[model samples]
Target chain A: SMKAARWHNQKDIRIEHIEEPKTEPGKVKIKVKWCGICGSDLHEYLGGPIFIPVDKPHPLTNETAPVTMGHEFSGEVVEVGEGVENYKVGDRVVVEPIFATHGHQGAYNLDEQMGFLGLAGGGGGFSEYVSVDEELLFKLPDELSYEQGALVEPSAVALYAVRSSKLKAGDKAAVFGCGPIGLLVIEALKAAGATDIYAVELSPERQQKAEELGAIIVDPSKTDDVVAEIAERTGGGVDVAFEVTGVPVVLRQAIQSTTIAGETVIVSIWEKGAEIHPNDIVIKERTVKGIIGYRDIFPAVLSLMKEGYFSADKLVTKKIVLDDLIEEGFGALIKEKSQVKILVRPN
Target chain B: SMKAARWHNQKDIRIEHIEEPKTEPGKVKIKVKWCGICGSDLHEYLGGPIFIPVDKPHPLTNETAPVTMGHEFSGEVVEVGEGVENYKVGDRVVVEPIFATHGHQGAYNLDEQMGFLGLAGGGGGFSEYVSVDEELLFKLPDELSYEQGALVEPSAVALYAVRSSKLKAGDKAAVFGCGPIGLLVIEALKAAGATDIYAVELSPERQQKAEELGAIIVDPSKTDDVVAEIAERTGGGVDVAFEVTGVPVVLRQAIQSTTIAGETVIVSIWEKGAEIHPNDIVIKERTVKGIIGYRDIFPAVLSLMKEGYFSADKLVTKKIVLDDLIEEGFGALIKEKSQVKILVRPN
Candidate 1:
């Protein structure tokens, strides 16, 4: 039996003894060394089965609830199944965490039956080991730590968001939230050569982190007119505005914070609906594009990570054993808004 | 002095005697042979001074309200201003009708100070012998009728809408509101080699025109669910949608009538604001782009017209002289919804 943290139901993630996943042909089993709790994981804990698929199994994965809970993880390959030539024992790697009919291309995010390997479930990284398809694996570079390896999942998201946006080099940009994702977005923008990045954040700690990461922080509470301030600062708004807050009204601010013919990229997985005036986009001839989880970007993120882009030392704020995940991991993230990224050690 | 149908205030258009516009340096004066009344002209008549600059003079043109009205027109060059080498006397031509600092580019439609020649004031097609900048002139091909030349303005709009969209040659599209712009969008899509085109409209006459132009019309009043029907018919919504109807609710329908990763181009110059849910765009990773007046597309539109893409014989429903402009022109458009494009003989 293997020890794993499983999502039994809403707010019912349990660490229990489960049969260790067996390596199959075309699959590689990884010794789960480090796993990070994602916002979607927290979302599942609080109000799920959002992506847990309670009523019926997801079409792609063909699995349901009682699935192990972590997708953002890094480990060393302990066993390689038959027909899997990409990995061997002792290979350092991370999972891309996707379940789709066809693999990543320009837009696997727009796949018809797309889900996640962890949330939609076959085997996930919250356990001692996860048997994953060989295609979902990306080799960890020599310079990246295992903790940094775990950060790749969410960091890939931020990178993809920035890459998918219309932000060109030397363009001004604004990120509406300063969560872990937002901070990573700042780093990604810097890597992409974005000039003058502005981050709107309410959290004092996150604000400090954002500024530390070289973003000019705008405290929304102190700012009466964030849109006007940003517009005035950037000379009639930024070239691209990113909405990462997931707060409904922030979507509007994101759209209004761009200049004429600017773009707004929605990066959050919105649980609720938001209302926007069509004239805001129409009158300015502005554009708004949305992105789901990244597609074909793991390698890019890894290269950036190897170049010291999304450093775990800067992002990961907390770490805990698998036993403390329920109380110290997800609970701390819920009660303490200051916590950025929390990595869990299973073995 | 010459007779011109000029916009005074809301609902106050009159055929008044005005000084004939003279050619200036780098300008060509055309004998206004035929001009067509556009929807914006009607918008100004019914509810606006929207673009007529009632409060102050326009920046580029340096003129304000009571400006001569019709932008969609064609004529023969009668006089060329000094330094104007593009056109000679008796060159049959059409006006592009724009007021911008840098003039038409690939996306001058997104220009901050973009405004139409007629609405923003210069000299307009509604009058005889109007002077236009050389850059705004495009020689009419002999194969196209003067009436076809008049159709160029609206046709350019349709062409730009399709060109600016994320649509490919074989993609499916839906146009909400089968007005003249919508009908032309169908022709534009056909020219672009679209596989299927759907038009949602209320008017039977326009629906007939759309059908005639190779569109499968979906009468919203008759259809139980326009969005659902389009989605089902197009194998889960269209690849691109055009919001030609400025109706607020129809904007939502247009946005909803696209497949995942689809695009919706807002073509109408909206009078009032409209509300749309951000999730519709975010969840499916859809994009919404807005286009103002046409840009850098006049030659392409003219070229396509030469290939018989936009035929005046098919698009023009009525032809009236300048004397009957008030009753038979704008009045017929408002009263009779069957009128598609009504060419006004301004000579």
Candidate 2:
């Protein structure tokens, strides 16, 4: 029997002991090491079926609720299924966690009917053993620990966003949130040579973290209007804004915080709709675009981490066992604005 | 004395006898020829005060309502104010019609506090004579008639929109709303070498005109869902979408008619707000941007008009004397869907 954290419903995650997943053709069974809890998981926990299926099964994943959780994870290759020859036992690697939900344009990350491995069907990282298709595995470098490998999934998101945008070297930017992804975005912006990165965060711990990383802070709690504050600080506004806060009002603030031809890149998955004035976009000729996940990026993220960025020791605030995954992972992330990234280990 | 259509208030445009504008330093006085009624004029005539100042005089034009009300026009320079050396009497010319309503990226079109010639206070095209700064005058080429010269202002708008966007040569495009500006945008797209131009419009007369211009029509009134229909027809969606209708609902439609990572260029000025799902943009990585008036584009538009694009004969559905502007110009634009561009000859 293997212990795995399974999602039964909103607010109902179960640390159940079940028979381990068997390896299949082109599959690789990984003995889970470290899995990072993500905001998407939090969204599913607090209020979802968001990416989780309810009435009908997801077209890609086929399996839905009661599916294993945890996408940002690293593990050791334990068993290889039939026809899988590339990876052998004892290989260190991380799962890209894509369910190829929703081009995908060679960006399999954008495939329609896309879902993630943990959320969609295949066994997740928060399990003693997660059997996934071989396609999802990227060999973790020997110099990095499993903890560092776990962050590769999320850092790819941040890096892809900044790199794909019109933002180039010496450009100014504002990040609307400073949570795990937002913080990672800061790191990514720095790596890409952003000159001034203004972080709009209310949390003191996150603020401190952002400042430590050389980001100027714009505390929404301190200002009457964050939009005006950012507008004033950047002369006209920042070049690119990353809207990490799913708050609808902040969406407008992000859009309004750019200069005449600025861009706002939305990295958040929303639970509700936001209101927009077309004139805001038209008059200023501002751009508002969004990204789902990273594609053709794991290799780049993995390589960058080797050169001293996306440090796991700096980002991860807590490391808990599978039993404490719920209380210490999702619970702390909700109650604590101080916490950034939390990692879960299943043995 | 001069006959001019001046904005008295909403639903109250009067063709009244007024004193001709005296040429000021750096200003050129022109004997008016042709002025085309614009959607903006329609907006002010119906639901406005939009750009027309009420309480205080506009900072640039130093005039308000009771302001002469024509912008898109061409004329012969009859006199040049002191310090104006670029233009002389008998030089055929067209006014750029920029209020400078809002940048100043050298593209005065984006300048903050920008306003236009007629609405924001400078004497308008719907008059016997208008005295404007020499900076606003562009030499009308002999190949272009006065009617074509009048279209320079509106055509600049359409041309600038397509040229400024990510819409490059050989791209597929969808234009929402086939009014005058929308039709001109089609022309711009054609000049820029768009492979396919899909126009979403409701009016049959406008649809016919669009077809005559080699545009494929998607009638919203005919389909229950324009979004799905566009998606199905384009294999996924077009490369870029231009939203020209100010109607709030069409805004969403334009954003959804593009492929993943596609762009929607907003060319409309909204009177109210619209609700948006950030997820749509985030999930598809779609972009929504807006544009205002044109900048540094008068010469380019002039050059293009000389190349036989933006032909006034094809776009002008009606030509009326200045006395019939309110009824045959603004009224016909409002009451009849058949009218495209109405050119007023003020002699």
Candidate 3:
């Protein structure tokens, strides 16, 4: 038996007893040590039960109940499945937690198929024990601790966003929503050779982080217009705009802020039927593509980590024990706007 | 001696007796038979005593007034200059008529060079004895008649539009305006493997021609909403939309008709700047590029003609002697709006 945090609804996560998962062939039975929270979790907390499908079993787990919390998590490989050759027991690692659903149909597999660990009762990693697929568990570098390892998922997202964007040297970028993803976009922009980075967010604390990363902060609330501000600051327009907020309105602003013939990479996850102007896209020569989790990026992210290209530890604001999960962790994540990221250790 | 049509001002063209031009090095003298009048010629006729700056001095041909008028003309090569090996005397050909002005700066080379033929005071192919740079002349196939050869220029324009669009096979396309350019765009789209072709034109006669070319007609006057009609007719929306009419209102409608992730190619030669919605382009991942002229496509046009891809004879509505040019060509092009294309013989 194992203990795990289950999210029944928004503001309803409870530490409950669950059965420890077994290692099948090509599986890695990892005992989770730490897990991180993201905006998608918050979206589920606020408005979702999104993409989990109503009155149906989760595609992976075949469970009809609400998904257990924590999609971004780090754990140690305790047992390997038959034919699982890459990993061994007692190896500390993080994970790439996306489980693809509707394969063979290509994009449908892309959208419907991806089931995260905590997303489909795949075994939430804010747990004493959770079994990860061998392909999903990525070994952490020597310097990174278990808490630092938890930051890999979010850093991978930021890395993937910039990698996905066709940004080149001497280009300028404006990042809307300076939360974890937005700040990560700023960092990625810097790494991706964006000369001038404008981070758009209202939070003073997040704005300070942007400044620390040597980016110009655009307080979207302080101005009547955000697009105009970015356009004027970047001179003509930003080469690429990162829409990380997941707010539909800000996403609009982000798309509009790009210059003629520029690209807008939408990092924010939204519903199936998000509204957009089809005409503007045709006439301006701009491109927008839906991005899910990282695929085939573990090696690249690991290389970047080894090369000191990214330091994910800066995002970790607070670390909590298994018992203190309620007051010190979930409460800050739920209540505070300035709370960038939280980590939990299940002992 | 040969006779050539000369346009001095609006609605004024005369067949004049001119001495034969001595073929310069890399020059090919063409005996002009048929020359099509284009919309740009209309602009020059309506808005010029002086439209394009004509530099007549020690540099380029120093012409103070209107020189030879027609640019889109086909003829036979009567003579070739020294070192002009590609073309020979008595070779039937369509003259491209582009020439570079040897400026003092010497920086003028490609598309950006300030000095090019078809500008003011530069002798053009409207004349029966027009001499052109050999670099611009393309040999016409034996199967193509003088009247059909006359269409090679406009067909080249349409080809350039389709090529610049980068559309793949089976993509649906719509051309707004059923003028010579638009009809040719329909032909180009058909040849380019466009599955669904829609022609939006107000003129009933032109619409009938569009139908003859196998395009579904969408009359904006008849439809309450143009874009909606196209969207419904094209299932989701058109894969590519060609804006042939330079009118801004029609351009707006064209952009609206294009679908998400589809492309819109603007083939219109507009005098004023265009206004478009930025949101429609960026969010839907559409693209629009400004295309001006054809580059190295005369050979491809010849190949298409050889394969019987299109009958250029169908597009030529009327032919007039150079002396009756205004009444038979320009007047028909403007007042009646009935003429698709009109060719002129000098003498």
Candidate 4:
């Protein structure tokens, strides 16, 4: 048995002994070295009884409350399941937690076999060990640490976001909202040969991070007219605008700010209906699109990381044990917003 | 001197004895048989000094005041200038009058010779006898009379709109605002084998014409949600949406109504500055494009017309002489709103 950080009820994360996962067909059991905390985890942590329901069980998994909450993690494979040839025991790798492809938007054939291993009773890495599909694991490069590998999930998401926008070489792009994913978008934009890029963000810390990635930081807080500024600076308009923020008002503003015949890629999943005026689109002939979670991201991101595209080490700010899950791990990141990336340990 | 329609000022059109155009080298002189009154021409009539300045002469032409208006037209080649080889006397043909390509919005290369012959000095087709470059002349089919040939200009534009939009065979399309151009879009759509086509207009007469052209008519006044209705009928949204009316609001609605990954081709040349919503475009991955005048429409439209794809007889609703330019032609069309096209002849 291994200790895990589980959500027992709303505002209640319990650190308790949990059974270790056994590898099966198409799976690889990893002794998780590190797991990164995400903003979505915070949303679920804050009075999330409304969302995750702790009274009985999840509708899909039918598991009792106190489910493991982590999906982003990196580790070494201790065992491999049947029909798997890619990975072997003692393999240093990062786990792609996706286990099922029920709602995947992409057209990949493997999406049909997707499932969320850790969160779906297949076991997650908040504990000492977790088992994931073999198709969803990737051997990491020797130079990277477990903390850096933990960030592979969000990095993949950001890569997919920029690509989905169709931002080609020599094109200009602007990212609205510079969260973790937003910063990754800035990196991906540069990697894709985007020159005149602007990162619109309210947080000064994130703005500095964008600057570190070589993005022209536009403090929307100070600028009264962001769209006009972009239009003037880019000489015409930005080729693509990425809306990583799920806020409706910011989404509309991004649309207005895009250059003629530009594309606006929506990476965030939004709730309910959004009001969009089509006249601008008709006159300028722009496009808008949305993206789901990354498919086939593990192997690709591992390669890019090896090429020095993903800088995950600097982003991970803190580490804690299972006993500190509530106060130091989740609470410090959620309440204080002090940590950029958080990792946890289990025994 | 021959009787010709002259626009002395904005909204001031009269039949007067004007000097006949003399045949010159590299030019072909023609007896004007039928000239079409285009929407831009009407825009000049209702809203003057837009195309033709009021106070000063045309910068390129060096004319002191307003010039005689008429561009879309057809006539017989009564005389060919020295060095002219392809065009000869009694050769029945139509003219592609290129007005201006002096700005970013248009290209001069489309009719380089015609731009010099027409927009420079002694250009436009309201005169009884006008001389134009031999290279600008396109001979009509044996079955096409001067009246039918007069439609070649607008038909060329409609055909170009379809061609530039890249709407291949079996694609669904909707033409917004059914003026003359709107009906012509339907004609082009039908010619292109777009089986599921729609014409959205308020006028019953135009609606009937659209239906006659094998299109389902969607009256926005009657339908609560026009886009939803179109989406439902076409199995999804239309593959292409043609914004024929320059109204910004309708243009927005047109783009908004198109399917995911759809295209909105703006055929209506609008006055500058229109608002666009980028959020929907980002979500839907739709494109909006701008199209000015025709570049490569002569040969394709001619073949389609010859193949009985579009019937000029159905499009042409009235015929008038230069003597009754205002009363029988423009006035009749505006009053009854019954005509699709009105071909006028100078006497």
By TM-score, the best candidate is 1
Q: Write the per-residue lDDT of candidate 1 for residues B1-347, one digit (tens) a residue.
A: 89888888888888888987767798998998889888888888999888898788887888878898889999999999999877899999999898787777656766667788889888788888788898888899898888889999989888988888888888899999888778989999999989789989888888889999999989888889999999888878999999988887788888899988899998876645566777788778899997876678889999998888999878899989888888898899989878889998865
lDDT by residue (tens digit), candidate 2, B186-213? 9989988897899998889999999877
**Model 1 TM-score, all chains together:** 0.96
Order of all candidates by TM-score, from best down to worst?
1, 2, 4, 3
CA lDDT, every model vs. true structure: 0.87, 0.86, 0.72, 0.73
Who wins the DockQ comparison?
Answer: 2
In model 2 chain A, where is the ten-residue run with the lowest total lDDT? A99-108
- TM-score of model 2 (CA atoms): 0.89
Query: Per-residue lDDT tens digits of candidate 3, residues B1-347?
Result: 66666666555656677777888886787888788887777767777644455344314545555567777788888888988888877888886644445422222222233333544545666676777777667777888898878888878888877986867898899899888789888888888888888899999889988888779999888989988999998876798888888777777677677775666677765545454444454444555555555656778887887876657656778888887876767778888666777888876
Better of 1 and 4 by lDDT: 1
Q: lDDT per residue, candidate 3, A194-240, as tens digits?
A: 88888888889888988887689888778889888888887657878
Error of 4 at A65 (Å): 8.4
Residues B109-204 of candidate 4: C-alpha lDDT, one tens digit per residue: 332322322223455677788887765779987887778788888898888788878588998999998888888989998888798888898998
Interface RMSD of each: 2.2, 1.1, 8.8, 6.3
Instruction: Residues A196-268, candidate 1: write the lDDT tens digits.
Output: 9999999998899999888998888998999999999988999999988887788889999999899999887
The native-contact fractions of the candidates, in order shown, are 0.71, 0.95, 0.03, 0.19
Query: Among all windows of ten consecutive residues in candidate 3 chain A, which has the lowest summed lDDT?
Result: A103-112
lDDT of 3: 0.72
Per-candidate TM equals 0.96, 0.89, 0.69, 0.78
